[PDB]
Amino acid sequence: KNPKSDKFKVKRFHHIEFWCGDATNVARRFSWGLGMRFSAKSDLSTGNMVHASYLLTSGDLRFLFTAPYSPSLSAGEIKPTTTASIPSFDHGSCRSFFSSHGLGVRAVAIEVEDAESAFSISVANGAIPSSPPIVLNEAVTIAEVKLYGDVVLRYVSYKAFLPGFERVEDASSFPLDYGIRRLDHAVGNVPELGPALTYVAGFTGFHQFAEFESGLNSAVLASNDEMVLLPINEPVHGTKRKSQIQTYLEHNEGAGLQHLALMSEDIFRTLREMRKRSSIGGFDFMPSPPPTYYQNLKKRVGDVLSDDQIKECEELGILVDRDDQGTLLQIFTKPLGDRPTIFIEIIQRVGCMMYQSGGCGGFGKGNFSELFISIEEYEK
Amino acid sequence: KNPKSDKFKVKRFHHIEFWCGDATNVARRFSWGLGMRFSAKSDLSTGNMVHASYLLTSGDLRFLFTAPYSPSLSAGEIKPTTTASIPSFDHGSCRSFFSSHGLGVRAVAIEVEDAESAFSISVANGAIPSSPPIVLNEAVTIAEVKLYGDVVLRYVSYKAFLPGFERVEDASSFPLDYGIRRLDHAVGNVPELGPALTYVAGFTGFHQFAEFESGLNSAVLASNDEMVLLPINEPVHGTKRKSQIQTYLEHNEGAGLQHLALMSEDIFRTLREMRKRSSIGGFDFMPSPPPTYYQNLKKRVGDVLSDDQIKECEELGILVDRDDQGTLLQIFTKPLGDRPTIFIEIIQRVGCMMYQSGGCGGFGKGNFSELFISIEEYEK
Ligand SMILES: Cc1c([C@H](O)C2[C@H](O)CCC[C@H]2O)ccc2c1c(=O)n(Cc1ccco1)c(=O)n2C
Ligand SMILES: Cc1c([C@H](O)C2[C@H](O)CCC[C@H]2O)ccc2c1c(=O)n(Cc1ccco1)c(=O)n2C
Ligand SMILES: [Co+2]
Ligand SMILES: [Co+2]
């Protein structure tokens, strides 16, 4: 059931912005690790004395890495004379963010029809304003409201990347590509799911995306065409294995973004290319499941991909779940940084053709039960 | 003239420690970029709740990358119960360091016979104590005194990497190597060279290493066998091209480490391997000199390396200078991070054989005049 109750017109995910202490080093590690191209910059070379910002791109996926310069570089400026290309940026907010959380996502940015309307309707419906709408170079409008923890939902709208960014020179832009094409979903961990759901659903009009005892309870908010998907988790206390959600909240100093799920047009090529570079600057993957997993996946997805492909899934350590309209392939990286907080998910969806509809396959919650069962089978 | 006046027995450079906000991402960028192996760790996986520390190695070169966890992880601990493997570490000092300077070197660590004596004699001779000597696991003694800015000279001594670090598992350690073998010199920028020289020379007994109007004035302190080399720069104000030293001090918020010079056993292989990876996660190099440089280098170093090698120097953009005992090959990277502060120098020294004596060739100051002259020649 999709009551299509969006309070403003939303399009798709536009970019994800990381706040860090050195944008250069994070951007180059991510670029090599995920096979994303260096496509735009805003920094000293472009006259920005406030923040260094570098954009990586793969397909429609846009990763933005920003860090503050010394405030002394811009001490004579005021907000009307700023040289920041992103007007919401704040030295104190960014330093406080990185030192409280470590490396992580500051903004989940969705493109909308009208960022001023989106901000107005949002706050009129309970959103906590973060940065009021500002029109950049008569071309682009940008506005921010609080999402959870210190993460903001960022609205961007185009009358026709951002003003004041520069296209990178082709000799500095190497066309890496491991198959990743767009952001599928972005997931937050909070201490209490109920109030978090109520707040966000309340100011966007996003509806609960339907689904179908380890870790969490979760629920997925979705826009009208279910292309913008925002799952949210809370811990399940009092178990025997400590919830990784509660571990997240302890090491992250509170609520925040847990994982980004990136869609690949060919998860086999992606995971081969990423695994090649794991121990030479790229990303580590979570430990593979026992072969009993792949010894049971013929009995569940054997109509969807051949035994040659299921064997190919066994080498790369890929998980496979299934809804009632589609099948989901997925795997999880180790944490992107020092703390056991944010990680990335690689996914590919098969089914639900009309274009592919959003969320085809679900999000893999079944893989929890399948994993534990596959563990016990292997053990004995 | 070498009066060999060291006030305590010094051996060689032991490691360089970077303070950052995320150790993981800097370490992986440096590892791929410079061809250094991941060899030791101290972090949550090893029971350290205070700081994450990862060591990269290439030959005798040891790069340490450290960042703080949330203080909340270790709030119950006191200095006697600490789980930090490096006792000098301090959350507040490290956060304040990264937010004031951005990415940079916190410690230049030299190995000594007796770190307690080294610290005692040092402070008795004007050194500002930074961290008193502490004996780690009855095996290693560690002590710190201020060097310049927020950089400390770190003494380490072994009765027989550090206690509480772990050897990395071979499946996580990929044996990268681009030829780099040891740290040659570490260079500081200060606002006033005179007082800086007087202070450091005063508490170490290091002597002025002999040399032989753009940029700087500099002077090199050296230990008895001139293997530990600490050059220091100050700006030359009132020119026409702004001193890069003064630019350093403005963007770094004061004095600090300017460049690390890394010796390669084969600078041609090193620079080929590093240049291959420049735009896929590695390091950028400063713009090459005009071919007029290489058109004049036959007339100055033509007795040292063939015209085939001088042509090989032209492709890689390598500089060549010459003292009266040796010849120096060198090239400079772009800044390692967001700010125009720290950069790395790759060098190889030929001559002064007895083993090779320290500083063989000098440090390339002549390449300043040669560069400007080679510019003007090309232009007309
Ligand atoms: C993050 C995740 C997901 C979903 O993506 C996520 C949805 O997006 C949104 C709501 C549900 C929520 O779970 C699904 C399966 C997972 C994991 C996951 O992190 N791990 C690793 C792990 C090891 C020990 C503890 O967790 C897994 O094993 N499985 C199977
Ligand atoms: C750092 C450096 C050195 C020495 O290593 C250093 C010694 O270690 C210790 C004392 C002297 C001191 O200069 C030598 C030659 C250099 C550079 C250097 O940074 N650049 C780049 C640049 C472009 C514009 C402004 O600077 C150069 O061109 N040349 C030729
Ligand atoms: Co997911
Ligand atoms: Co040098």
PDB file of C-alpha atoms in Angstrom, chain A residues 21-26 28-30 32 44 52 54 67-73 95 98-99 103 171-172 174 176 250-251 253 278-284 336-340, chain B residues 21-26 28-30 32 44 52 54 67-73 95 98-99 103 171-172 174 176 250-251 253 278-284 336-340:
ATOM      1  CA  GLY A  21      39.385  16.493   9.115  1.00  0.00           C
ATOM      2  CA  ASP A  22      41.255  16.046   5.866  1.00  0.00           C
ATOM      3  CA  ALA A  23      39.056  15.806   2.780  1.00  0.00           C
ATOM      4  CA  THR A  24      41.982  14.948   0.474  1.00  0.00           C
ATOM      5  CA  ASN A  25      42.984  11.684   2.146  1.00  0.00           C
ATOM      6  CA  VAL A  26      39.455  10.347   2.644  1.00  0.00           C
ATOM      7  CA  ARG A  28      41.507   9.445  -2.432  1.00  0.00           C
ATOM      8  CA  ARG A  29      40.998   6.332  -0.284  1.00  0.00           C
ATOM      9  CA  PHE A  30      37.313   6.178  -1.267  1.00  0.00           C
ATOM     10  CA  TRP A  32      40.515   4.003  -5.291  1.00  0.00           C
ATOM     11  CA  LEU A  44      41.729  27.227  -2.115  1.00  0.00           C
ATOM     12  CA  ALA A  52      37.880  22.103   1.133  1.00  0.00           C
ATOM     13  CA  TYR A  54      35.956  17.260  -3.319  1.00  0.00           C
ATOM     14  CA  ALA A  67      36.854  19.551   5.830  1.00  0.00           C
ATOM     15  CA  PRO A  68      37.469  22.995   7.355  1.00  0.00           C
ATOM     16  CA  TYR A  69      40.496  25.188   6.723  1.00  0.00           C
ATOM     17  CA  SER A  70      41.895  27.353   9.507  1.00  0.00           C
ATOM     18  CA  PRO A  71      39.238  29.944  10.447  1.00  0.00           C
ATOM     19  CA  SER A  72      42.018  32.544  10.189  1.00  0.00           C
ATOM     20  CA  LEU A  73      41.928  32.240   6.395  1.00  0.00           C
ATOM     21  CA  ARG A  95      35.012  20.452  13.954  1.00  0.00           C
ATOM     22  CA  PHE A  98      34.269  15.191  13.432  1.00  0.00           C
ATOM     23  CA  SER A  99      35.609  15.216  16.974  1.00  0.00           C
ATOM     24  CA  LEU A 103      34.368  10.191  10.095  1.00  0.00           C
ATOM     25  CA  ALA A 171      44.746  14.837 -16.292  1.00  0.00           C
ATOM     26  CA  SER A 172      43.703  14.866 -12.613  1.00  0.00           C
ATOM     27  CA  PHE A 174      41.193   9.180 -13.856  1.00  0.00           C
ATOM     28  CA  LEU A 176      37.797   4.626 -12.457  1.00  0.00           C
ATOM     29  CA  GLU A 250      28.221   4.004  22.007  1.00  0.00           C
ATOM     30  CA  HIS A 251      31.163   4.491  19.632  1.00  0.00           C
ATOM     31  CA  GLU A 253      28.352   9.228  20.545  1.00  0.00           C
ATOM     32  CA  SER A 278      41.067  -4.391  -0.145  1.00  0.00           C
ATOM     33  CA  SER A 279      44.565  -4.701   1.276  1.00  0.00           C
ATOM     34  CA  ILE A 280      46.124  -2.082  -1.027  1.00  0.00           C
ATOM     35  CA  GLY A 281      44.152   0.961   0.141  1.00  0.00           C
ATOM     36  CA  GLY A 282      40.539  -0.103  -0.484  1.00  0.00           C
ATOM     37  CA  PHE A 283      37.757  -1.493   1.721  1.00  0.00           C
ATOM     38  CA  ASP A 284      37.571  -4.706   3.733  1.00  0.00           C
ATOM     39  CA  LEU A 336      34.853   2.780   6.625  1.00  0.00           C
ATOM     40  CA  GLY A 337      37.010   4.355   9.364  1.00  0.00           C
ATOM     41  CA  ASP A 338      38.529   3.895  12.829  1.00  0.00           C
ATOM     42  CA  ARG A 339      35.275   3.464  14.709  1.00  0.00           C
ATOM     43  CA  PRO A 340      32.787   0.574  14.376  1.00  0.00           C
TER      44      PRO A 340
ATOM     45  CA  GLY B  21      41.110  12.459  12.791  1.00  0.00           C
ATOM     46  CA  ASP B  22      40.794   9.088  11.120  1.00  0.00           C
ATOM     47  CA  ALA B  23      43.950   6.977  11.177  1.00  0.00           C
ATOM     48  CA  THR B  24      42.470   4.282   8.906  1.00  0.00           C
ATOM     49  CA  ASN B  25      41.905   6.472   5.849  1.00  0.00           C
ATOM     50  CA  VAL B  26      45.220   8.334   6.027  1.00  0.00           C
ATOM     51  CA  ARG B  28      45.553   3.377   3.555  1.00  0.00           C
ATOM     52  CA  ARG B  29      46.101   6.393   1.281  1.00  0.00           C
ATOM     53  CA  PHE B  30      49.764   6.603   2.336  1.00  0.00           C
ATOM     54  CA  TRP B  32      49.057   2.646  -1.541  1.00  0.00           C
ATOM     55  CA  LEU B  44      40.117  -1.595  19.744  1.00  0.00           C
ATOM     56  CA  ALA B  52      43.786   3.973  17.068  1.00  0.00           C
ATOM     57  CA  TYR B  54      48.531   1.882  12.586  1.00  0.00           C
ATOM     58  CA  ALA B  67      43.683   9.298  15.944  1.00  0.00           C
ATOM     59  CA  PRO B  68      41.582   9.505  19.124  1.00  0.00           C
ATOM     60  CA  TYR B  69      38.513   7.416  19.889  1.00  0.00           C
ATOM     61  CA  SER B  70      35.621   8.918  21.832  1.00  0.00           C
ATOM     62  CA  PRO B  71      36.872   9.784  25.345  1.00  0.00           C
ATOM     63  CA  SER B  72      33.765   7.988  26.640  1.00  0.00           C
ATOM     64  CA  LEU B  73      35.340   4.643  25.732  1.00  0.00           C
ATOM     65  CA  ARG B  95      42.034  16.973  18.872  1.00  0.00           C
ATOM     66  CA  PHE B  98      44.400  18.249  14.258  1.00  0.00           C
ATOM     67  CA  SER B  99      41.894  21.086  14.404  1.00  0.00           C
ATOM     68  CA  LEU B 103      46.991  16.639   9.077  1.00  0.00           C
ATOM     69  CA  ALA B 171      46.284 -11.771   4.843  1.00  0.00           C
ATOM     70  CA  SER B 172      45.831  -8.124   5.900  1.00  0.00           C
ATOM     71  CA  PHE B 174      50.146  -6.873   1.430  1.00  0.00           C
ATOM     72  CA  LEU B 176      53.936  -3.288  -1.219  1.00  0.00           C
ATOM     73  CA  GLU B 250      49.778  31.081   7.802  1.00  0.00           C
ATOM     74  CA  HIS B 251      47.922  27.925   6.738  1.00  0.00           C
ATOM     75  CA  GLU B 253      48.701  28.183  12.261  1.00  0.00           C
ATOM     76  CA  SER B 278      49.077   9.634  -8.499  1.00  0.00           C
ATOM     77  CA  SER B 279      45.551  10.013  -9.831  1.00  0.00           C
ATOM     78  CA  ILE B 280      44.275   6.698  -8.425  1.00  0.00           C
ATOM     79  CA  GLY B 281      44.706   7.442  -4.714  1.00  0.00           C
ATOM     80  CA  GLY B 282      48.434   8.223  -4.453  1.00  0.00           C
ATOM     81  CA  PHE B 283      50.472  11.441  -4.301  1.00  0.00           C
ATOM     82  CA  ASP B 284      50.815  14.269  -6.810  1.00  0.00           C
ATOM     83  CA  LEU B 336      49.985  15.501   1.532  1.00  0.00           C
ATOM     84  CA  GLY B 337      46.611  16.918   2.647  1.00  0.00           C
ATOM     85  CA  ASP B 338      44.116  19.774   2.271  1.00  0.00           C
ATOM     86  CA  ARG B 339      46.415  22.552   3.414  1.00  0.00           C
ATOM     87  CA  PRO B 340      49.568  23.809   1.644  1.00  0.00           C
TER      88      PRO B 340
END
